[PDB]
Amino acid sequence: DLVEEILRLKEERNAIILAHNYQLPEVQDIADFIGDSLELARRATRVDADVIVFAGVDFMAETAKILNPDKVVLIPSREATCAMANMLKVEHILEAKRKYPNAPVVLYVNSTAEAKAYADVTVTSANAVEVVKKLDSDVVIFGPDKNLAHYVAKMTGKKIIPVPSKGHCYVHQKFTLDDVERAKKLHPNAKLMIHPECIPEVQEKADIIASTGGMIKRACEWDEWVVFTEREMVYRLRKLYPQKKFYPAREDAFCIGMKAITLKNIYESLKDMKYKVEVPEEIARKARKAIERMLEMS
Numbered sequence: 001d002l003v004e005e006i007l008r009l010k011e012e013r014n015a016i017i018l019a020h021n022y023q024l025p026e027v028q029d030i031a032d033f034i035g036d037s038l039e040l041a042r043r044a045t046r047v048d049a050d051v052i053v054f055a056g057v058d059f060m061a062e063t064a065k066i067l068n069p070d071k072v073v074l075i076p077s078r079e080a081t082c083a084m085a086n087m088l089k090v091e092h093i094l095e096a097k098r099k100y101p102n103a104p105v106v107l108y109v110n111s112t113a114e115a116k117a118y119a120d121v122t123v124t125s126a127n128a129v130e131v132v133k134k135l136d137s138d139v140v141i142f143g144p145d146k147n148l149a150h151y152v153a154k155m156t157g158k159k160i161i162p163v164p165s166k167g168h169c170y171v172h173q174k175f176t177l178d179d180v181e182r183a184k185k186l187h188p189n190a191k192l193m194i195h196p197e198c199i200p201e202v203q204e205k206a207d208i209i210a211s212t213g214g215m216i217k218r219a220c221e222w223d224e225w226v227v228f229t230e231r232e233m234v235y236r237l238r239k240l241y242p243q244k245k246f247y248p249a250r251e252d253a254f255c256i257g258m259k260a261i262t263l264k265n266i267y268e269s270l271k272d273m274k275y276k277v278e279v280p281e282e283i284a285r286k287a288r289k290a291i292e293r294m295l296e297m298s
């Protein structure tokens with residue numbers, strides 16, 4: 001029985017399990033903390049665990065390691081990867097800095113640790129506007145998501161240059177205006193909670209624009225919601241709010257990287273102490289400074 005063995009090994013390893021909101025229900029049920037990556041990493045800094053098992057994708061485990069350098073961070077599969085974060089290369093950043101002289105470089109926290117090391121500051125979707133409004137530049141380099149960049153440009157009035165120019169999340173790009181229309185026909189009493197990684201024309205139809213943490217916070221505002229994000233979030237919301245209704249905007253909105261994590265490989269991760277996530281000291285130092293600036297600016 002995986003669950004029993006996982007729980008026993010978690011105690012033996014002095015480990016905590018951090019699960020992203022898109023993890024399967026059976027994985028979330030054995031997690032200590034559930035949320036988005038930055039809040040998970042920060043919550044781990046307040047406990048004296050020796051090991052973090054990160055049920056999530058590579059860049060999220062990296063953020064955990066950046067904020068918890070004295071803990072062993074394990075990712076159950078190195079195939080738990082983020083296509084959007086992987087679109088951005090260091091060369092994209094250096095080239096953009098050359099093309100937009102002196103413009104600040106802002107990195108969405110959904111990004112690799114290496115990319116954060118070239119950032120002046122990081123942002124979450126929830127603090128991106130507040131942070132960017134404090135940059136005294138009409139032009140801002142922003143990556144890796146062009147769709148969040150559009151939202152930031154709209155809310156700040158600044159010229160936001162996405163890096164890379166076509167960076168985006170393939171999961172959230174699946175949502176279309178037809179999915180909006182289908183939702184309104186089938187669920188006329190529902191409101192639409194839409195992730196800022198969705199395309200601009202879909203964002204425009206939202207009742208709320210929110211990351212997963214904001215979806216949980218603002219779900220209290222209505223009794224029925226159609227959810228424009230990765231489909232496992234619906235189960236997360238249903239378990240949090242059993243008396244509300246939540247429906248996926250698309251049944252096929254599936255992050256392959258997130259589903260690389262299984263009960264079986266969480267068991268194997270704890271049993272064998274793999275796969276170790278490391279962040280080079282200099283990259284970690286610079287990524288840490290960009291995260292610290294984000295707190296100072298919000």
Ligand code: SF4
Binds near residue numbers: 081084256
């Ligand atoms: S849902 Fe998109 S942005 Fe999130 S981990 Fe998957 S590919 Fe990356």
